Paper text:
In this study, the effect of physical and chemical factors on the orientations of macromolecules was investigated through an analysis of selected well studied macromolecules, and important parameters that determine the behaviour of proteins on cryo-EM grids were revealed. The test proteins used in the analysis include human C-reactive protein (CRP) pentamer, CRP decamer, human erythrocyte catalase, SARS-CoV-2 spike protein, E. coli [name] and [name] β-galactosidase. We performed a comprehensive examination of how macromolecule orientations respond to alterations in physical factors, such as freezing temperature, and chemical factors, such as the addition of surfactants or the presence of affinity tags, during grid freezing for a standard set of proteins.
[name] is a bifunctional enzyme and consists of six poly­peptides, where a domain-swapped dimer assembles to form a trimeric structure. In the previous study, the structure of [name] was determined at ∼2.9 Å resolution using graphene-oxide support grids. [name] adopts a preferred side view in the absence of an additive when frozen in ice at 4°C, with a tendency to clump or cluster. However, clumping of the particles was still observed at 20°C. Hence, CTAB was added to the sample and the grids were prepared at 4°C, which led to less clumping and consequently resulted in a high-resolution map at 2.3 Å, as described further in the next section. In the current study, we obtained a high-resolution map using CTAB as an additive during grid preparation, with D3 symmetry and higher order aberration correction during image processing. The resolution estimated by comparison of the half-map FSC (at a 0.143 threshold) is 2.3 Å, and a comparable resolution of 2.4 Å is obtained from comparison of the map-versus-model FSC (at a 0.5 threshold).
Author numbering:
A (entry chain B), B (entry chain K): 2 to 679
C (entry chain E): 620 to 679
Amino acid sequence: QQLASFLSGTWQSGRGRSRLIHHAISGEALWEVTSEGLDMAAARQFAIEKGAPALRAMTFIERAAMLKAVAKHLLSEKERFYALSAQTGATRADSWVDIEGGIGTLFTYASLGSRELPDDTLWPEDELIPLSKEGGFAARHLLTSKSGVAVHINAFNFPCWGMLEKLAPTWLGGMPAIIKPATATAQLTQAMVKSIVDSGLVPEGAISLICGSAGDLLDHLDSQDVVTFTGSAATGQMLRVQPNIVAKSIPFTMEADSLNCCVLGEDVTPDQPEFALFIREVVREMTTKAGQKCTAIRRIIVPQALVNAVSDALVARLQKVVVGDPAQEGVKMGALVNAEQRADVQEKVNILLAAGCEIRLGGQADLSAAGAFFPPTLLYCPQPDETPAVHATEAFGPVATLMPAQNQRHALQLACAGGGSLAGTLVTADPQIARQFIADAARTHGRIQILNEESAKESTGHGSPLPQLVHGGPGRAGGGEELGGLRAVKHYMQRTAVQGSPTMLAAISKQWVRGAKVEEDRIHPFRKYFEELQPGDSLLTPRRTMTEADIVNFACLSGDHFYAHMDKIAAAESIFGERVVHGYFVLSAAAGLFVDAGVGPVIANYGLESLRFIEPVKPGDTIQVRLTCKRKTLKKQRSAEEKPTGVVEWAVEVFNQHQTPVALYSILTLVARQHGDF
Amino acid sequence: QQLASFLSGTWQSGRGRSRLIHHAISGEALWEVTSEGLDMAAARQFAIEKGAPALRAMTFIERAAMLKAVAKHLLSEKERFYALSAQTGATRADSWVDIEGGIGTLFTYASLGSRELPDDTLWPEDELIPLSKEGGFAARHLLTSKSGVAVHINAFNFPCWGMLEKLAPTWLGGMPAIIKPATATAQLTQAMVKSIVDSGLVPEGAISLICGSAGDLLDHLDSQDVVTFTGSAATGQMLRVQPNIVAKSIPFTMEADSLNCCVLGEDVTPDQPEFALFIREVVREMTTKAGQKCTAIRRIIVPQALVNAVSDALVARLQKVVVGDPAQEGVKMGALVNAEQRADVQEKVNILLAAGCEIRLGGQADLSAAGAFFPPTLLYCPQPDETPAVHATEAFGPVATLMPAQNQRHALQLACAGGGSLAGTLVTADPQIARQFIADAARTHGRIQILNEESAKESTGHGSPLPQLVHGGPGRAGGGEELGGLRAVKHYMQRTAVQGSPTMLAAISKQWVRGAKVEEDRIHPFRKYFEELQPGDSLLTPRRTMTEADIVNFACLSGDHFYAHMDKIAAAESIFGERVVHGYFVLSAAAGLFVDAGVGPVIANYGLESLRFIEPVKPGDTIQVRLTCKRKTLKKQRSAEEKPTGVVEWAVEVFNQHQTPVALYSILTLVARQHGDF
Amino acid sequence: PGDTIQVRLTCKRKTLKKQRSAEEKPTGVVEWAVEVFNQHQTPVALYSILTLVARQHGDF
């Protein structure tokens, strides 16, 4: 039953030297995997000629909606994925984290995209940068999709999460994806790819899959493609010096093995809740998915005095973990994915012992049984700062090393001796200890959690990467960065500075910018439905002369009697030199000048975005407002009942009688549409 | 006279095989350069043991002040720099570009840093991310300095701008720098390093200088270091696969040779001003410092019909450029820097001719003269889309190739045929043309300018990278990114997600976050001076019950009679279902509840940052405000006269009587300090 | 109009009130001196206000 790979739009396989996928529990070879003789160049050309322009023609909103649809469809069919995940040696909870976290990543990126990306195919990322004095020359930065294909080489740990956490920003960025899973678990990736393809929800050529070897696919890439790698450091570093990849300046992100730490702060005593949650945390991160997560804890750093009590508690809670076939009731920790991984973990443990580690629990595994089971293992390092192997060697399984520290600073040095890690944890109740730990050791960790009693009730965990937070680390951890919210979307896009006149920048951005041409229409802009509005639709209001009576009435009604408005003596000694009008009254009176009173398309206001008070307004000044439609963003109907709306941002400029701007800001509104999209 | 290297705090030189620095005009060898036998490992250790912690102890405000002081001291002594620049073959305007642009980059980064970086040693880049339902578990992203040293390997084009361009963000990020200029022009870099060092304005070990070869410096770097390279693509791609750099995941960004284009829009005709400014632009970019800038125009793409007119105009304007010794009155364009560079330019021109290019203006130089002069060379390519060498070969001199296009889209394809460029220019007057060009060709360009009549008045240029805009490009341009404002500062820092309870995150951040512990005083916070204020100092105000009278009075005073407030019939079928209170009146009444009236340390309000209206406020509801000090930022006294103030951001939270929030926002404020720092 | 006023509020006289029972809250009577000045610091109004003020400790 050879495993097919989906490329050039067809399901096909290869012929030659194979590899086998065994059952992690029984040991039977239940899949054969090979991709020899497949035209890799044809697959790349297929993804580029028809997948990429199809994705790029969609606006960001349409791509986010497509992410959401795909997530829903994948969620409806999760039972198939659970049944396949059972073959890899996972309990129901590990398959849960993998499956449900991958789909939840899709949902999170869909939400972020809908909420904060433009309704366009281009993405203007910052505000307009003025580069002159009369305003004829300005700049802003834009992001456009790269035109190539994204190749994601994933590791066996998370066959579904590891694919979707990369796939979601790849599509949100507008790029097709060629996915190459790890051979040892490709059967679970294939089924999810087949589900996505058979849903009909994504464009043709937007997703390809290589089961087996990539062949010479990297030799055919050019500078508009991107490559991401997850796995062993040797394979990644070999890929990093790929002659084609270095000749074309192809972006390459690497995520290697890291030695994640968990530190116990000096301030805690064994009679505190922090001690118990620390023990529970170390055990959970040691034992979930048999400790095969990239973020699983590998080094435990405790104060010298606490070592014996900590070791007693760890072995006590850790002996109560039953390893076996999760289909049996009473099993809490399954097996490694194959006997090869078991041999690798055993030889790493043997290296650590040969380099000066004592067994506290279960160092040797049954290296002959059918299932790839490993017993939970807790090691001890007595000379932590002169045993350099414990800071470089990572057994990729339920194995962790306890080690002592001193004076709360030796612990920081030991945490940094890892050489760059993905995740670290500090259990403490003292906020100053946590400040010191961050300021000293954040530079070697990609993610750090301070774990006290309050955070422990809803904390997601030491080993769980959330889609909103970056996932990566320096040095030993590869150097790359994933999952930083929209930070990940930007890795599939080119950033470009665009210089020119404001009017040109407005036309290019499809958003109005300061100083650009406007259009006046003799119909108030608040009477136009969403579709009739264009950026640059502008209204000059009538004037209102400020008076002393306005200062008095506003101070009274609001209750703000700040001396700058109500005290002549104190105002004379201020920077302005006399009494001025309240800034909030300038804001309110401006709204009074431009707001259309009667029922119309404008539904809500709900938001003001960047208000600066530039010049003071005095009694005797006359103010006037220009209201320009700045940006529009359609909102997708989440049902057939909801009335179709869109978001409109408006630029507001308040001028005095010298045409001098005295206030600048944006308002957000909800505006109704004439045509919904169900 | 041998050029010294400043490493380990001492001025020293090397002994062995040397390179010679010849005068570009006369040809005399006036410097000898070698660094053999210098302890590079000692230099790096000197940078990281005393330069790096010294820079890291400074807040971003102090490092910005140090940048400004260094820029001033450099500007005062610019005559020496101009004199050493004369030796390189530069007219007064080219040296002005280099010297004043480098110093202006320092000034700009000082300004950006003092204006928008925290008064701390850590940089919290984003707002708090809630990760729980009850608010016990959240996260935000921090940036902290890396521990290592930054090695900047610079090119000969811009010996002053090329160093300070990288040095400003390196220091602002808290990293020591080791500068390695190009040997051919290291005399100008040495003098600027001498100025900086004998100024006494920077910490010890914050800048080192290697004149000549780098020896084995790259072999001794670890994961906390960063490397940058500008120059030849072969040398950079060799550095990219340096075995130590790849084994340790050391960040490495490369900038190489790019074929910058300049398209003429289909809309323009010879009778338009666009045509004249297009000619002027191509000629200025061709002849400024002999066309030796990385952003010089190399490919001119015009419509097939305009080809002969453009070729007449370019030749005419370009014969008027007098090349010679710029010390002679009447010279407009100087020499190249070396006879070696002149030979390289000549052989690139010969390759282009051998690949099918027509001479339009002189293309043969004097390969025996003492000065390294090259005449302005304008080539012609008759069949642009089938001679691939015109899109791959770059003569680093006063050489540019004219080529024809068709149908407005062949020109876009030609622009993209360069394989990734730093800069491109489109001359047009039609904004739709500009939008099409951007949307299709931004992905292969790092910077693009739309050049019309309005922008021509104050346009800084095609070839001048401004410090606010990114400087880089994909593919053939190396793939790197520089100068993007604070974007470049973040390349010398590590980004880290920190999860925990809001109280822990507030301690780590030194800024109050939503949900964190506050502290109340019995003294109103607005009566405290800057130094007495602490993030989290908080005031619960008294309550104000909203009535129908308040709605009527505010609508009357402000003029806003929007139906949701004043029309009970229309409000009946709104989403709220009855009349509500104006959001701006909620804002004003909140200010009335918390603002202290009497003269105190609070000087100005001037700002409101992120206002959302969460829930409607109805008549009969009672509101109460919690005002919390969120973030403090000291402002440096720019004289001894001005009063010392600081910037305080305040968190405002308005609650109704169910303790439900109805408005959240921040106010900015100027607060007087007790003690200035002159 | 154009004059600026400022007030000094001074506690003038305190008089404790005996609790009628063990139930009623213990208050006292405070008379306050009020002095309103204009910007030449000359007084423009003088008067006293009476006030009921809550006590911390009753005497049943």
